[PDB]
């Protein structure tokens, strides 16, 4: 199971993706979709691991010294879009929607 919040644990924050705003008119449907993201810290906090964790955000903020705040459950989305060969395809695009957020 996971956390769902809006506006400091590994919680699911909401985010709608806009293809027109990005400038991708090659995607017909959906133009917009609720995708969401996972943000926040993961335990054991705070002692012994702490130096190794704090040293990580100094060296590489993209680096993970332990469990990461990443989606656990991911639902696919059906998409209508233009291909290079001037045709229109319908495809089941996997891992596009964040359902649940947990610690690895």
């Amino acid at each position, epitope marked *: 199971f996971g956390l769902d919040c809006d506006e400091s644990r590994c919680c699911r924050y909401p985010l709608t993706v806009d293809f*027109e705003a990005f*400038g991708w*008119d*090659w995607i*017909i*449907a959906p*133009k917009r979709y609720k995708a969401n993201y996972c943000s926040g810290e993961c335990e054991f906090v705070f002692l012994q691991k702490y130096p190794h964790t704090h040293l990580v955000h100094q060296a590489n903020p993209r680096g993970s010294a332990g469990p990461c705040c990443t989606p656990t459950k991911m639902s696919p989305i*059906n998409m*209508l879009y*233009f291909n290079g060969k*001037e*045709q*229109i*395809i*319908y495809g*089941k695009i996997p891992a596009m929607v964040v359902d649940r957020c947990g610690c690895s």
Partner: antibody, heavy 116, light 108 residues
Framework: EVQLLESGGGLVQPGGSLRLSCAAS????????MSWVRQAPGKGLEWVST????????SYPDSVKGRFTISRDNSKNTLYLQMNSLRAEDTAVYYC?????????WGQGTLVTVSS | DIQMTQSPSSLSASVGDRVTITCKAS??????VAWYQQKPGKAPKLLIY???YRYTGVPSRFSGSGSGTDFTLTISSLNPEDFATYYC?????????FGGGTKVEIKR
């Protein structure tokens, strides 16, 4: 109130040209992908062409490809269909519609007659 | 290309009746099926998009179901305004092909 109004259709000789227009109003046209679909008198429905919201992308069936060109002018809120090298088999009522997963909201159409 | 075979070609029914219209694809089309309603002298109206999703304003009595090569638009209880022609369509791969149509007549 979403409105789609076709115009520019009628009689034309085979091998001739015709340019259809479709007046969009009541929604943000520049953000919506558009389609042209025809219906020959007794016959059912046939997909003619689809255009991307920006206009960069277009797809056509082999029946009208090379002859017909779907174009748009988002500033004019208008959809176009240039029909060149017309054949009798292109006689139909031509509809313009909003393209999402399927054609949601269709215009009443315009009849194009190709005969000598 | 990809063919849509619609069944029945025509149907005589009365108001309140539960009716089902089937459609079959020449290849696997997943859930990419759209249903439309057209009345004589008028442009078609969208009913269901992507096999089961109903469009805004479409009454709850209209319900699509299916996956692969088998699709069924259902009208739970027939109403006077439901007597029209019904067309299934694929929005899987271009060229986009339609079904033959189903004329729903008023039985008297």
């Amino acid at each position: 109130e979403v409105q789609l109004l076709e115009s520019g259709g009628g009689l034309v000789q085979p091998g001739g040209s015709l340019r259809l227009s479709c007046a969009a109003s009541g929604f943000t046209f520049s953000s919506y992908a558009m389609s042209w679909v025809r219906q020959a008198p007794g016959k059912g429905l046939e997909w003619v062409s689809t255009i991307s919201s920006g206009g960069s992308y277009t797809s056509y069936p082999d029946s009208v490809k090379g002859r017909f060109t779907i174009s748009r002018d988002n500033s004019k809120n208008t959809l176009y269909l240039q029909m060149n090298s017309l054949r009798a088999e292109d006689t139909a009522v031509y509809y313009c519609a909003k393209q999402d997963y399927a054609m949601n909201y269709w215009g009443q159409g315009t009849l194009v007659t190709v005969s000598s | 290309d990809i063919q849509m075979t619609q069944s029945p070609s025509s149907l005589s029914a009365s108001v309140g009746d539960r009716v089902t219209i089937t459609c079959k694809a020449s290849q696997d089309v997943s859930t990419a099926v759209a249903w439309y309603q057209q009345k004589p002298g008028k442009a078609p109206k969208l009913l269901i998009y992507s096999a089961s999703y109903r469009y805004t304003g479409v009454p709850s009595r209209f319900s699509g179901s299916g996956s692969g090569t088998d699709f069924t638009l259902t009208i739970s209880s027939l109403n006077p305004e439901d007597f029209a022609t019904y067309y299934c369509q694929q929005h899987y791969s271009t060229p986009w092909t339609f079904g033959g149509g189903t004329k729903v007549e008023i039985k008297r």
